Nucleic acid binder design. Sequence first.
RNA 1: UUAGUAGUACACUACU
Length: 2031
Amino acid sequence: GMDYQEYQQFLARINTARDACVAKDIDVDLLMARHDYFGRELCKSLNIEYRNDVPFIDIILDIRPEVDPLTIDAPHITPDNYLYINNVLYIIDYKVSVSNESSVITYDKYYELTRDISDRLSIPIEIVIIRIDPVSRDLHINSDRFKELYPTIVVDINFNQFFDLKQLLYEKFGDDEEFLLKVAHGDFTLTAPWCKTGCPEFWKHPIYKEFKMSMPVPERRLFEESVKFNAYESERWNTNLVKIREYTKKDYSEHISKSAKNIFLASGFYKQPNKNEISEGWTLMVERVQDQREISKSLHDQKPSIHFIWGAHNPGNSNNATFKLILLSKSLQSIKGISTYTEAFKSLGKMMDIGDKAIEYEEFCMSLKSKARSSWKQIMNKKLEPKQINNALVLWEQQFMINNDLIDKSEKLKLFKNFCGIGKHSKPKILDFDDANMYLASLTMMEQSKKILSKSNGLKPDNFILNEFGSRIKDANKETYDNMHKIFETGYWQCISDFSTLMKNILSVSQYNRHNTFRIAMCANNNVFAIVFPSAATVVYSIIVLHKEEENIFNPGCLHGTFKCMNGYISISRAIRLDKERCQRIVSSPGLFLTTCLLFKHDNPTLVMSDIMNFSIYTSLSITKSVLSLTEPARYMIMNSLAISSNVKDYIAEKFSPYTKTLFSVYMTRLIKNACFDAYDQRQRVQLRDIYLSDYDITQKGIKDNRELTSIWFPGSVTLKEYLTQIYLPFYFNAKGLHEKHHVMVDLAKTILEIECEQRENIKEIWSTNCTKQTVNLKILIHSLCKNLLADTSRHNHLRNRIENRNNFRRSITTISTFTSSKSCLKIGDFRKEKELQSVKQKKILEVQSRKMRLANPMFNYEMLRNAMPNYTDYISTKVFDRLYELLDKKVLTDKPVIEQIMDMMIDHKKFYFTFFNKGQKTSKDREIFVGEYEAKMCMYAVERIAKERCKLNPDEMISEPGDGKLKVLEQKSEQEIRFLVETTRQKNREIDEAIEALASNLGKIEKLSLGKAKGLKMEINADMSKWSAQDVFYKYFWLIALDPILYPQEKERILYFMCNYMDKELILPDELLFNLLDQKVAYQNDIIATMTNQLNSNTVLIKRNWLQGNFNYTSSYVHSCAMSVYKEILKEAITLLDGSILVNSLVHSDDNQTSITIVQDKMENDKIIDFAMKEFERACLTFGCQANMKKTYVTNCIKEFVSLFNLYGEPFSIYGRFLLTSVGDCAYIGPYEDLASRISSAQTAIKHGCPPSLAWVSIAISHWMTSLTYNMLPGQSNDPIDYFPAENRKDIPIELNGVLDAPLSMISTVGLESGNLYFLIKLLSKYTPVMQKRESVVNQIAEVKNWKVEDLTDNEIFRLKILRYLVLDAGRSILTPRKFTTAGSLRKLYSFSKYQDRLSSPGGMVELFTYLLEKPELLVTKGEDMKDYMESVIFRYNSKRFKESLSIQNPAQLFIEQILFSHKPVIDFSGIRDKYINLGKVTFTEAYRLLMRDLSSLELTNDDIQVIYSYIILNDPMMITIANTHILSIYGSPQRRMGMSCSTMPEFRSPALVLRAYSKNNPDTEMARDLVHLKEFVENTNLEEKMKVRIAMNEAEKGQRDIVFELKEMTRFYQVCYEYVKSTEHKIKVFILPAKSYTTTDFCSLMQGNLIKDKEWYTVHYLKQILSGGHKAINATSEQNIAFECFKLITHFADSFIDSLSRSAFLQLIIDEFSYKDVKVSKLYDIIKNGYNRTDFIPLLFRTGDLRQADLDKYDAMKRILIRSLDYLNNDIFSLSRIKVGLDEFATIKKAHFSKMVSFEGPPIKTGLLDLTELMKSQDLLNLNYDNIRNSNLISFSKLICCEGSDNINDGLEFLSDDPMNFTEGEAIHSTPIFNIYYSKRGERHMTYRNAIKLLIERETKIFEEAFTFSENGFISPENLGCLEAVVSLIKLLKTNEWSTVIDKCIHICLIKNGMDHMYHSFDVPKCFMGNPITRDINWVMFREFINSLPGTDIPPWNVMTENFKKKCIALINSKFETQRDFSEFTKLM
RNA sequence: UUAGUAGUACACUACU
Ligand SMILES: [Zn+2]
């Protein structure tokens, strides 16, 4: 990026400097260094000459020197650069800054002065100031004339390297306040106050009394003093803040020492995990569980592991519906024996008989299905009636009627009372997992499963996934394709998939399942069936299977019993009562399952594939809560047990509680138990990779991947990365929303009331010194607040200004999202009236639904609560957008500034109320959400937001960093430590290491000195705080508001009052919880809920110290940061004692914490400091009121846990798996494209977090599978659109119609779904383009499109383009989307929806809205900027029936079934499809394909229509421009192993609602005026201004009068398509893990491309031309130049690196003339360099050719006193093209380029004795700049570099190679606790030249070739063998020159030239033996043939296989020559 | 709103 020379000198100046005024100048010099750097590279980007601080009076003299500068008055300014074209002078003053505030100042200053001579000379002078952003990198130019000149400018600039120097300078001097004084943009500017008057009540409040009670009396007054302090009044802002700092400095200075001095007190005794410590924990766990749960040893109490019973399919019987129905009927009737429900199952088969009348079932059912398939809506009013067939009364296809005559009254009861459990109505029941005869039973269940499921399907291993994605999986990694087959083949896959396909059909049936009906559900298996019994939503089902022989059935613990029938055996499973939410997951279980297996097995050959799948079905299908209780606690139980410092005992003895209800759970528990002990013995089995560090980051970082560790869930060995996956991944198998709300509300309530009681009874004291639970070290707090509050205001002065802007404090409440959102909200008051009326309605609807059930199968309160509970404070649920509307209409909210309204609300609202609703997430331990009043939301907003922008300043806080941005931060901080550790070790041990190499004589004396030295120590505290919210003093936060400098006194009074009320805040127990406790039935022994509510009197309990979970994150997080800031100071004083160095780095995120400590020792042992660090860690937490959970907290020597994002020893790594398990049931079930959109987004996310392409593609397959399974769009399904459309396969069917996503992953990762459309257009620009222009930019290939011929194209090719233009372009672009008939639902709670009723009811008032909205069309798309505007927007919104539904929650489970059932019904309205073709009702999916073709065939494809596609898609979006370029200019290079992974940021490829108001009326309300100009162009170029008006203007003559509906609906479309153009998208933080650091776009592109090709090897990427094009106005000049630079940089270095010094000019001269780099002649590139204005870059090149003149030297010398003859003399002994002396010791620079580019050279061969330097250029292996790599290289690699034309003495011929020394890589151990070797590049000695390397290679490798090709006991001598050699090398020329043969020839050649036998080799033709007659050149193939067989061969590596293949090839080939398949008639003609 | 009466409608259908 930047120059290396200036970096080194600026780094040294930071250490050299001591005083702040010296450090000041280093910051000033760094600005100019960046200033010129931007200018140097931009001048080449614009092709102009570079200049610096050139006077304006001289700039005119270049244009017109006839008038002298004295008489003509020119403005005396100092511009940077100038240009004169088109009779206009353009003045340049480039500058790099974040804001244009510094640019407009210099703009108007220049514009004013330049006008003095602008009218004097009558030549207009334009000011062109170019500014670039130093982080986001965006170009900003003010000149409009300059915009039209340069359409696109190349800006791949690097500031990343500049900020590295800034970090160093603001580290040493950043602590000193003398340096902070010098950096200022106003010193300190405090903005306008948010309030006018203070708060008197705050000083009176009893909580403020209680605050000062505990506090000491000097502190009491200080708090008074601090609040009343105004920062704007006193001379400086830090008057008070420093004053209170200096008071507490007595106790602080002492307490910092106190903690630090404990380093000597410590011992080598810390909570370390050990086999016994784990064992002890388990035993106390057993005791706990055996009390807390009812332990059972009986095998009848178990629950099903899986809720399914699979049995082998029967191919002998027919696979057809009607047949199976009767088959199961007779089968069920035929059941023989006696049980409980035997005669019940018997009659059920009897009630589904058809027999003779099989054909009547085929018709009757098809009529009913056809009746429903006609209508969009369901068939209402008409009564469904059954038809008597044999004994059964069929109601629908596979639906029957329960006939009360066919079953006994007693036998009907048995089935429903006992078996189905309809009418059945104290510890939990669990299985003893410590019983070996229970663990046995559990193991035998697995042994049983493996015995049956391992057996193959025997059916074709070809399903949609493999059929359509197999190709794209296989090419990524062939292993995974096979792995997939291995699964699909095995009964495992058929078992799950048939349960999936069966459940889909169980749900589909269960929807219309009545109370007098039992339904039958069949699957792809013709033995497996299911019976769905009447449900009293709840699905009641049994799996009924007809397995072959007895016990050829899989029972996981689900089966009721097997039964013998009259033909075979039939088994019926226990009645399962599951919920649709659970069942859904079972349907998507195969996708979950495949991923599980593939992820585990991936690239690990030691694992048993049949054992992975054996475990996987029991996970992917496990829907019980038994499993979650294992999967979650395991993650910590393993990691704790393999960490260094960690408390396992306590975690296993308290936090671990198995709920082993099922039988898999028992087996899985013991898998975990065992895995805990294996960890302890593997702690030291972890190794640390050899770190190849050579300045600016490291490649080959992180942990060593060694397969020495042991797996957890199955047998085999595993890698660390894989071990971690096996540890953490299990938890993501867990299922969401399993927690029954009835139980959650109780346990959530109980906990809050338990911890509040704790505080009420036990915790009384607030502050303390000894450090105790819920206590803060008040003196230490106040100081550490003061110190940080200073540094978080000194580093940014406008801090109060930044808060106002970024959080919209000044603007009206109606603008901020958090307030105008559709989130849940709590309303307080009295609703006893409507709450009673809303309840009794449902209590009647209860009886309504019961009355109807009494007729068919006779099986069978809010008033009470209010009457019973006296002190019941009444509340209600509402919406956040609705509350705002309510508070405005009743006028308490206004257009007053939101903060100004907040301040008043803090003092107005005095009592705060909060309610909780459960999340019920995948975790077994349930999480609560506290949601209270809207009034509260406003208060917390300010307090939290003020802390937000404060927290952002501190780099330690990470809640500030949105998205997965933390991952890179982990890395950047880990790398800083790995570097520091090395740097510091080399700085101390250098004195000792010198003596070691000196003596190494006797080695017995060396060990004495090698012991007594410095010792490295790294450690990471992977923390997790205990009860961050509940067990935390809220009183401490009062001080943060008090001490605050950027808060006014009248604000400070008001903030603290609200917080004073947030102590007397009440928790409302929601009614649903109170209803559970309403019906007593004997109360709880010790009822905590009743205790706190006084035997249930009030529904409110007061919560004090427990500030509610998530309400004060940032606030608490700043105090956390302040706490860890102390921990730093503690250790940093402790390590100065021992005399060494320490680097502590703390990452803070509310409750999740990570703190990395790196120490270089001298005195005491490493293990002492380990215990010391942990002591002060808890101390640091507890001195601030927070307590650290030592249970979950673990410490490693590498690993970093932080928010579950993991960084290893530099190498960042997340659990790629967790995101692949999302693409299964994560969608809103809207449409085929709409579903896939989010399912592929989940796959895109995996790639970010370092996922292999092979597995990435799997998710893409699964996603498609589920997507197509939802709407019956799979191959062979109903809506299968391959026959309906013209196409070969689903790759060619548009993804809008649902097909497959045919694109490269490197595109899908970037854009996705749209990629599939983009690839179909790039395919064309690689088919329908000529030989010229195709190799050039994409832009050029788009110009040729309008010169194509339409007739050339094919049916499919035409088909895409027609939809792509007439449909896709304008309409998340979908065409097919099913519409529903859903109802609005109950919207009574809403106030705002009532005001729509009143405006709809009263006549005229409706139209009045729409007529008002037409004069303000800004309020159709965006919400109002003012009260009325926002309010009336809310009412209009209700117009949409979709927005009315949006505020109601539909179950995705129910939504899923509704898209299956409504697929054969008319759902897609064609009206909205045909409208576009023209500019009936709903249409069925099948008909939608037909009716699309009837319209499509009519449309016309032109040479223009196609050119609109290539404009609107490619040429419009600068991103799509580059993506297409990257895939056309792509040149994939060297395949390499993924050694070093690094984090990389996604690059850039680039007023809202107020602008649209200035479009409605052209007058705005200055910068916003300029924004409308480009908006005018957008609407005029597309011409959508007229197109919209014409569409309305001709509709009023179509309809008749004035339709207000069309007046708006068409006007809204016009404003919504504006929104996307006007309101710009925020470039959110996206981090991709790549094989190296991506600085700029091009770098990112190359590394991204190469990461998503193969799994085993990543590839480095090249490009012919620049890929970064900006549009279709910008059509090469800037793409050419850089090629010339690359070329000559490459050549000069290749020449001075490898070619002999003596003959380097000749080489260059030969290369320049007859050669070409990247299809451009090197001469033309040289001419481009010579005609350029940066010749100073290529001084040594120009001198060597004789194209260097004095002007260049004079310029070069002026950039950073010379003569030509001086150079001519000086460089008489320096022979290099990359370097010439331009002084006494100053050499010239050529700037080295990478050597992976030399392949892009194409010229005639240059032969040098024997070597062909062209082939050395074209070589891959022999281009490394490492001596050892080339010395220890293969002869196969070198054998390409030989021609020799009969040379001699190989030693002589190698004279044309560099006899200059090469660079070797040396490595050394670092002497850390995690001991690793650093490897770096040295310069070797002298005898390490390129020649000697080649020679040593030749010698070593030829010796091995000789002994392999002896074929006798002689050698490479003895003509008896030379004859054999001649024979073997003869055939090689008379056969076929493939690739294997030629190598042998050239190797033999080499070997014979070496031995001095190259005076005959060239005169070696076929011997006399083989040649019958010498003259008559006849060949005896038979002889030759038998000669090849008669060759013995050798088995020495590496030639053993080489020779073997050669022989076979040559034999086969020879035999081929003979074998000529002649025509049968041919010979019959000749003779 | 309130009450009474009569109703409430459909997927897989496979190499198995
Ligand atoms: Zn030769």
